Symmetry: D2
Subunit: 264 residues, 4 copies
């Protein structure tokens, strides 16, 4: 199944990989524009399809007082300016059923947060909003169970679903990426595009190389100019200056493996 996101950007497991790349959360217009512009410049140079990613709300910080981002209303204003400035499609996450329709007016893909992937009403609200849907696979969920979420989407008329790996629970706290999961998610859901979040899955290069070599529809990436200074106990973003170096290796492997067959 190939999922058409915007003109010239289509995701599919046999197609050239799509970078879903951006930042953790919207803090300001200018900072968003500058980071997005650098993503655009690099992906344009290399010839990699690109969807810009950001959250408008951090809905699950440790403290009710922790910074949560600019929020829904201002976030969608920022996304509108990004789309106008760069002609790039955008993807963002949706935490509450009531956000789905307003977000769908602006965003080109709506993401189901991993912890919320089983919540029927949220998933239905997101699926009914009429845009392609990216389902984050929670660390507690095996790859053959994601089909139920895909089915809930199809039951309310949305067949344009993508599935995003971000690791599996491995003891306490640690995540392991089972590289056999990508095919199992694809094959049990009718061939949904599979995307790999190499940021939350934690050596980013080892992991991204491993995942791209398997043969997948997309990469999911967060970046920052200075990741070590994040005001976050979240997982480290890629340092932004490393983007081109990373993506040139990804494209090289991706172009190679996408012309190699399965074993007969």
């Amino acid at each position: 199944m190939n999922v058409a996101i915007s003109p010239g950007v289509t995701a599919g497991n046999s197609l050239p990989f799509v970078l879903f790349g951006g930042i953790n959360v919207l803090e300001s217009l200018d900072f968003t524009l500058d980071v997005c512009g650098e993503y655009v410049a690099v992906t344009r140079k290399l010839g990699i399809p690109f969807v810009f990613k950001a959250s408008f709300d951090k809905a699950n910080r440790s403290s009710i007082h922790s910074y949560r981002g600019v929020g829904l209303d201002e976030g969608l204003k920022i996304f509108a300016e990004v789309k106008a400035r760069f002609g790039v499609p955008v993807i963002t996450d949706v935490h509450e059923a009531e956000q789905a329709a307003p977000v769908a007016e602006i965003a080109d893909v709506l993401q189901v947060p991993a912890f919320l992937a089983r919540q029927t009403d949220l998933v239905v609200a997101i699926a009914k909003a009429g845009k392609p849907v990216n389902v984050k696979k929670p660390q507690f969920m095996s790859p053959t169970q994601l089909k139920h979420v895909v089915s809930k989407c199809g039951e309310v008329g949305n067949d344009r679903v993508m599935l995003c790996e971000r690791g599996s629970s491995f003891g306490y706290d640690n995540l392991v990426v089972d590289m056999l999961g990508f095919r199992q998610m694809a094959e049990t859901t009718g061939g949904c595009p599979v995307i790999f979040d190499v940021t939350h899955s934690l050596q980013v290069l080892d992991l991204a190389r491993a995942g791209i070599a398997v043969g997948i529809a997309g990469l999911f990436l967060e970046a920052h100019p200075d990741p070590d200074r994040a005001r976050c106990d979240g997982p480290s973003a890629l340092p932004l200056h490393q983007l081109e170096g990373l993506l040139s290796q990804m494209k090289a492997i991706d172009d190679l493996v996408k012309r190699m067959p399965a074993l007969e």
Copy 2:
């Protein structure tokens, strides 16, 4: 060990006689709820075990939009109101949306945060703000030392009456295992919150229940059904309730009068 007063005559605490949070998966009819709740009340009253009746009014996380979800909020609250009026038993239920907490708190005696939702700031705050004691289910993805953050969110909005509920940790794909070292970790990192063990969702129910009760905990969380084979995770057969509870009580009374080592 902080103790949490649920009602007169029911108080949960890690040094106190265990409390049974028992009932059924989801509310379906007044008739069946009363049937099951009445058996729990009679057995617990006979054995002398503090009791809080448990049920969901909605199953918010089923695999299909057409899969039966239960009677829903408005009818659920009416059933709980009857359960309370007829038996004088306190009740606990789970809350899935922020806007549900206030109306639920008018009837329910304890509000539960669903496991998958434990990290969501707005839902937890709405539950905590509703002013009843809160039961936080520990997600299978969460280590026992991280639950303190959810509790702190509750404290941050004025609710210090928080209990923690164990239901297993992810062990490979699909399977859950219960780390019995987790109960003390949960308790000691949260200032001594009552710890509760869900022996149904964790899954040999007797083996697990015996093990958890022997550690010394505040409560057991249990679902039962008259015929769990032919119902559409597996509840205790309702006819085994008395036999299970008599062992739980026997072990619990023994261990709650034994100390830590020197």
Copy 3:
């Protein structure tokens, strides 16, 4: 289920009063061995708990070839002979090489298969052939239902006196978690072999784990102790032994007179 006669008045069985397999990590000196065992003997005699003294004569799997390995076979067996002569207690020790089994079985009353060697056909067969009861340590990588194949190898060469020993299961990197449901799976898939729980290797929280395992209803506890474990995984502080054991006996005596559910 099946009972394993270890020595006169010491019999291990899942329905019988629990047996303590207790001692120390490794034999270092006669003096120290006698000091610790003497303490175990006096506490178990006082409390009325069947006792088997445990120690390795060699640490075959330590991180450097210069790391201290214990007194070794010849001297270790001499120490075990003294222990037996002086206290009249039976002893258990582990066997790392096939040719050690015959010599060890002249002195030791139970031979143990080390966890990492449990699948090695030739070692297990030599141990089973030596003619004493066998304790099989369940490796952290093995599921509870697979231990049957090791027990059958013992049976294939005429040794039907086999016990099984839980020490935890791999949980992510490095850490171990004890699945309390494993005891019954081990017992039921092996014709009811006695199941023993190593609370030491499985890991301040020795008490939580020990209470939980003893409450399931098992044949034995495996325990290592040391007078000053911090300044010496981590053994129980020896001065805590009587406190730990009095609680284990109390729980075991209670649960061993309770049935399965109807």
Copy 4:
């Protein structure tokens, strides 16, 4: 980092073209061994991939004491001598008991420490003292940063020619997952030992092999058989032999590409 010379024209190293350590589960007869080795030689030659033939002379841990164990030490070494004589290939086998190390080392070119026995001091020392390169199998219970203890044991008795072989990690009961982050950790914590990936035991063979090879490693470890379904084992299934060329051509293409890409 470290390069281990196995024989003329065969050298394993994490920066070098990958080496195939390839063969069969156990030595059953001379002629079957020669035929299978002959097929590996033909394909590795055609493709230009360095090759070491692998086989066990004993299956030391079957479920039943009556189950077939292969030809045994004495006859196995006679078969190995003939393989070397006939094909000019180096060979690798596993050693289960201390006393087998010296006689095995007279014929074998690499001696392998079985995974379950990797912590056994006396076995590892007898293997290390035998004077040939050593392949330590990483047991599914051992974390990648702990393998350094085994390498140090080998060094303490004068053998610095050690390679480390990934076979998966325990993931719940029975299942294994391959953590693709472990390869670097094994290499960096041991002074740069060649890291090798057993795509057989670790279990979709192509997904896993593509992922591992893309990370950048010294070797692949593979068992094959003309009819794996009819194996008289309940062990993990061998690669069908007829798929060897197709698998290895993809491995070569990916390895050649990534071995000339830098760090970020």
